[PDB]
Design a protein around this ligand. Structure first.
Ligand SMILES: [Mg+2]
Lengths: 105, 197, 45, 77, 109
RNA sequence: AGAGUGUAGCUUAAAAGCACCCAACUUACACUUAGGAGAUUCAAUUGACGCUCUGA
């Protein structure tokens, strides 16, 4: 009740420095298997390090054999944190994979 | 107080060759293969023979060009399966220690400029390096008059390391030779921020 | 650590046999690729 | 069809891979924490010894937007 | 241009406040939405009205809200709630007064 | 040389709970189901084996 000390006990809706922008990591790989595995690993690293990941979609395949494409969206980095993130990405690239740090549009 | 301004860079050459698979990983390779055939969904002999002979005629480049040298520490291709770090001997007026390539910086030059200068100051080459951020990777202070050394980080994209037989003592260390070459605690802890992997 | 996720597989259900064919694009860099009908060696002219 | 012995071997394979990649992730996280804390203590020392350089230490290089770097291979050029 | 809006008040709300003796079947509170949630010995009608399932004293309390796992909207709200957060709702209980019955000597066989 | 000292990553937990990982469902994450390893440094509250800091 409004006048009682327990007023607002049940309210819940309120419960629901240089930084990068939107970062797109593009993974075009000869192998659907390797692309998917790299996407899983990078997503696991992101959610372990508390990185806001928005989308993990894929581009349509292009024929000219085929190369499978994946995308990882990232937002929110720190000075040291970005450095560690991309150096780990560089050091943990399994085999013949194409990274990217491009942005939206 | 009088302070000796000094920076330095722990250059990183990434492994051009991926690490070989362990026997454990090969057993998992066999398991994944057999499950793949189990879970798959549906003159060939002449084609198979032609393709296997096409494979046999061409010899694959050796993944390890290291077993043959055993002494080419100065060579950029000392190791391939693991990352490499530059390490050049230096001789001071009062000290003689195998020290990571250092350089002197001034308040008029920022740390990124100091690192860019050091990229070629001691190598006198056309190496191409890339920086990730102004954030350093290691700090070590040793006094005799204060002093400090900031080990920054950068990665080699490509390198035209001309005149490899330089008068210096540039050695590439992956993980193990770090302790052998750098005894004092202020220099043997570089592995903490060097990617051991 | 360039092998932690190299030992991974397709997680779908409809597909054919895939094999580790070595591929070279233009300069002599052989790479395993999951390719049908084992060639064991590929080169783009 | 399959057999009891190979099923047991597969189970032990899963066990040993669990242990192996557990150690892998543990060492990866150890390196993460070690070099992260090294970087933060380096930034703290930079702030202490240079009040005008930490301001530009946090700035980010604008050349990383078209980042490019290829992965490992087997037969180098 | 503005038509309607002539509906009268529903006369809804609490019919039995705390400390009121309530007999079985009595309506405790009528509500349009779930203002007061049913507590012990309090049943809900089709129209969300709370009625006493036992004869006793009405008590209003604040209790943690744990919706049924099949209540998809509430489960989604919980899934979006930050860790450490606990929802609370006002519950109406009927503390039974009389016992279920007594054992009486009926025949001295 | 001196100080803080001390349960697997965290615990004013006393051999536990959170953590954590792969397998399947997911493009992917998440959820869920199946599994996985884990510690009270050593001797009698005390001393000495390992880590951090203060110096050379
Ligand atoms: Mg009205």
């Amino acid at each position: 009740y409004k006048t009682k000390p327990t007023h607002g006990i049940g309210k819940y809706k309120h419960l629901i420095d240089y930084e990068y922008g939107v970062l797109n990591i593009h993974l075009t790989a000869y192998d659907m298997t390797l692309a998917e595995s790299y996407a899983q690993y990078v997503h696991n690293l992101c959610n372990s390090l508390s990185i806001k990941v928005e989308e993990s979609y894929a581009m349509p395949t292009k024929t000219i054999l085929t190369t499978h494409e994946r995308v990882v969206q990232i937002s929110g980095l720190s000075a040291t944190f970005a450095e560690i993130f991309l150096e780990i990405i560089q050091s943990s690239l399994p085999e013949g994979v194409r990274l990217s740090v491009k942005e939206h549009t | 107080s009088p302070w000796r301004l000094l920076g330095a860079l722990c250059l990183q050459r990434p492994p051009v060759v991926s690490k070989p698979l362990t026997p454990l990983q090969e057993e998992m390779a066999s398991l994944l293969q057999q499950i793949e055939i189990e879970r798959s969904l549906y003159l060939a002999q002449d084609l198979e023979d032609m393709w296997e002979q096409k494979f046999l005629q061409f010899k694959l480049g050796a993944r390890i060009t290291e077993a043959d040298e055993k002494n080419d520490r100065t060579s950029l291709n000392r190791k391939l399966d693991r990352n490499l770090v530059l390490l050049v001997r230096e001789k001071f007026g009062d000290q003689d220690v195998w020290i990571l390539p250092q350089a002197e910086w001034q308040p008029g030059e920022t740390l990124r400029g100091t690192a860019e200068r050091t990229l070629a100051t001691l190598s006198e080459n056309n190496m191409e390096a890339k920086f990730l951020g102004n954030a350093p990777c290691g700090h070590y202070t040793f006094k005799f008059l204060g002093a400090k050394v900031f080990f920054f980080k950068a990665l080699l994209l490509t390198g035209d390391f001309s005149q490899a037989g330089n008068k210096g003592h540039h050695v590439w260390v992956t993980k193990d030779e770090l302790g052998d070459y750098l005894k004092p605690k202020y220099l043997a802890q570089v592995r903490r921020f060097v990617s051991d992997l | 650590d360039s092998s932690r996720a190299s030992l991974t597989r397709v997680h779908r259900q409809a597909y054919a046999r895939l094999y580790p064919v070595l591929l070279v694009k233009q300069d002599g860099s052989t790479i395993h690729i999951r390719y049908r009908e084992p060639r064991r060696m590929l080169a783009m002219p | 069809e399959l057999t009891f012995e190979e099923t047991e071997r597969r189970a032990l394979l899963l066990k040993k891979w669990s242990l192996y990649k557990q150690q892998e992730r543990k060492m990866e996280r150890d390196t993460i924490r070690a070099m992260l804390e090294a970087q933060q203590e380096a930034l703290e020392e930079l702030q202490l010894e240079s009040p005008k350089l930490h301001a530009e230490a946090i700035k980010r290089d604008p050349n990383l937007f078209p980042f490019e770097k290829e992965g490992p291979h087997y037969t180098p050029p | 241009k503005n038509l309607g809006g002539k509906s009268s008040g529903r006369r809804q709300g609490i019919k039995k406040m705390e400390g009121h003796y309530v007999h079985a079947g009595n309506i405790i509170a009528t509500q349009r939405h779930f203002r007061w949630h049913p507590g012990a010995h309090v049943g809900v009608g089709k129209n969300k009205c709370l009625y006493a399932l036992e004869e006793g004293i009405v008590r209003y309390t604040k209790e943690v809200y744990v919706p049924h796992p099949r209540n998809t909207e509430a489960v989604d709200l919980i899934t979006r709630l930050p860790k450490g957060a606990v929802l609370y709702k006002t519950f109406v209980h009927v503390v039974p007064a009389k016992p279920e019955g007594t054992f009486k000597l009926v025949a001295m066989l």
